């Protein structure tokens, strides 16, 4: 299936915010012996990875590379919008 950049971004953001369970990150009994400041600092950050090819059906990314002259951030741009992106070549060789 061919998605649009805005739809992909919104779906990713919604899925990321959906499964944000603090109890999962810090299970028992480690939190049982923690102060408030350390607990809050530990819970302050997280991350998540998603593979679109694992969804039903598969998805393919398509876009136009655009290098804006304001922030120096290469983006994939379409009519719907834009998106931050990172480009690398083979075997740890920079683009």
């Amino acid at each position: 299936s061919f998605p649009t950049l805005a739809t992909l971004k919104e779906e990713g953001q919604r899925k990321a915010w959906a499964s944000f369970d603090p109890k999962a990150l810090l299970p028992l009994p480690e939190a049982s012996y923690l102060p408030s400041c350390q607990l809050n600092r530990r819970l302050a950050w997280s991350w998540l990875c998603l593979l679109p090819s694992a969804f039903c059906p598969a998805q393919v990314l398509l876009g136009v590379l655009v290098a804006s002259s304001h922030k120096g951030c290469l983006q994939l741009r379409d009519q719907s919008g834009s998106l931050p992106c990172l480009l690398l070549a083979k075997h740890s060789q920079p683009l």
Binding site: R41, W45, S69, K71, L74, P94
Partner: protein, 177 residues
């Protein structure tokens, strides 16, 4: 050099107004030849490089709308720029004092600067033609473990290549660990 907010200096012969803080950066590199002219599809034989006592080192200030080229600069890669139009002499050696010559506070006094122009563009050369220079594309320089772990406190320049284990943000000062 990294990309951040930078302050230029007083232009030569212009109004004495404080340069505004604008995002910009600069690079340092070494030349490989003299002035070169286009010839057909390719470029003509470049003029011989002057046997000058000055070190073959140049500094290029990138600012304005040229910041978009930041992501395509990496050490050890052969880069050739191009100035569209006629090959005006004295264009790839030093900044023209008469024209816009604004440098940051850390680069104003340098004797080797070359501010890029908007109409100029940059391209990557071919591997086979300049394979001789590309032979020095080994691992990036890095100080020894003893140098990084010796006590001293002289010097604050180190380099290595590591693998991230864990990341954690610090808040009360803004710091990421």
């Amino acid at each position: 050099e990294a990309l951040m907010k930078r302050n230029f200096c007083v232009p030569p012969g212009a109004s004495p107004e404080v340069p505004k803080p604008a995002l910009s950066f600069y690079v340092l590199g070494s030349w490989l030849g003299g002035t070169q002219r286009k010839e057909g599809t390719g470029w003509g034989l470049p003029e011989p490089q002057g046997n000058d006592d000055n070190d073959q080192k140049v500094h290029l200030i990138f600012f304005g709308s040229s910041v978009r080229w930041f992501e395509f600069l990496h050490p050890g890669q052969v880069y050739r720029l191009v100035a569209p139009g006629p090959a005006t002499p004295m264009l790839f050696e030093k900044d023209g004092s008469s024209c816009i010559s604004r440098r940051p506070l850390e680069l104003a006094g340098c004797a080797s600067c070359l501010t890029v122009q908007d109409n100029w563009t940059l391209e990557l050369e071919s591997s086979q033609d300049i394979q001789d220079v590309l032979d020095a594309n080994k691992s990036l320089p890095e100080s020894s473990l003893t140098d990084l772990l010796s006590d001293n406190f002289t010097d604050s320049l180190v380099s290595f290549s590591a693998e991230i284990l864990s990341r954690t943000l610090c808040e009360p000062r803004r710091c990421v660990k």
